[PDB]
Amino acid sequence: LEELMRTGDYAQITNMLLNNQPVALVGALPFVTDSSVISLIAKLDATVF
């Protein structure tokens, strides 16, 4: 991540995300807890991105 922001994106990520491909992000980050059983059901974790 650091290596991205501190250097702007080329969308490499944009493409991988778009043709919806398996990918990871390294480093520190926020983080949000949630207890909504339902939530999971509305695959929220697939949003934000």
Partner: protein, 397 residues
Amino acid sequence: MDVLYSLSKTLKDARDKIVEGTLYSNVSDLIQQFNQMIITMNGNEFQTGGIGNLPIRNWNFDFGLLGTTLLNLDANYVETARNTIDYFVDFVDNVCMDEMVRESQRNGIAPQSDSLRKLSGLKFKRINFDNSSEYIENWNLQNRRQRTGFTFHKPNIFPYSASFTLNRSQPAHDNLMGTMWLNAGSEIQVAGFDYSCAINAPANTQQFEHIVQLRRVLTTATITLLPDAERFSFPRVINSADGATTWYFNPVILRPNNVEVEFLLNGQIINTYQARFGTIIARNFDTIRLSFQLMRPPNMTPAVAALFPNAQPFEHHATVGLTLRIESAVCESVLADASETMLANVTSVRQEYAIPVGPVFPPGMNWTDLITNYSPSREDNLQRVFTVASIRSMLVK
């Protein structure tokens, strides 16, 4: 297919223009092209092998793009790159080889492998570039249809053929008349012999002729034509036509008389040369016809007269000959020649991996057998296979 090409000039114009030293800007137009690739790739998976002693390695992708740290590259930049290229190298090899073995009668002019059938896919076309490699240059022009063309030194157009034809013979083989020859590669040697030295022949002249039909037309051929066939200028003991016995050939050489070489195309004389030895040009032909004569010497010193009596036994056999060599030529079809390694590359990869004989090519990719029955299917497969060998040689020799 064209896809494949790029993948290489990509790497060569890469593993070459990328060194510890050059300024970025000398590769800006290059870096770009490169990355573009990486993207399209990562994700999709590939299978190679699955035949004879050919390993089946599975290739998967996952790579980060390329920095830019201005003002000439720092060593550290290279290594983190070479490490990413060496996966593509060791890859492509395993890719070429896989489609460099499969053959197909019906449509054996197109992709066969589970590796390539996926490359011609559309989502990949986004790569093609710098098509200056003589072979691809010609692959394309062929898909649209037009005057293609290749360059060969000492081309390999003549299937090996070494034989004779006795026009006059008898059981004892003591008074023969005929021709013997060797057609092989780019060379022809032919001798006409007359044991009687034309003693009873009209005008004391015996006519000879040798015709060679090429399996493909050659254009713009530079040819050396010389009198005499050294190969048939020495004493020989030869098997008879029926294999039942052996005859004796004891040549004495005379200059070929009224030499005429014709380079014909579809029965028409395109070039004709009368007694011209040295370098001659044959611009377009599918057949060569060599006509020459043995003329009994009208005046003979005693030593000569003694070789040619009026009656048998004929112990010195009058012989006249010609030697013709195609130094260079252009052919619209791929051929083996004395400089290109294509045939050897294809043949070598198949031999090394114990690839089973297929339905198209003769066992061992035998050149004589191949050129003797150079069918459209063999040519399309040969061209595909030669083009791949040439793509491979840009990186792996």
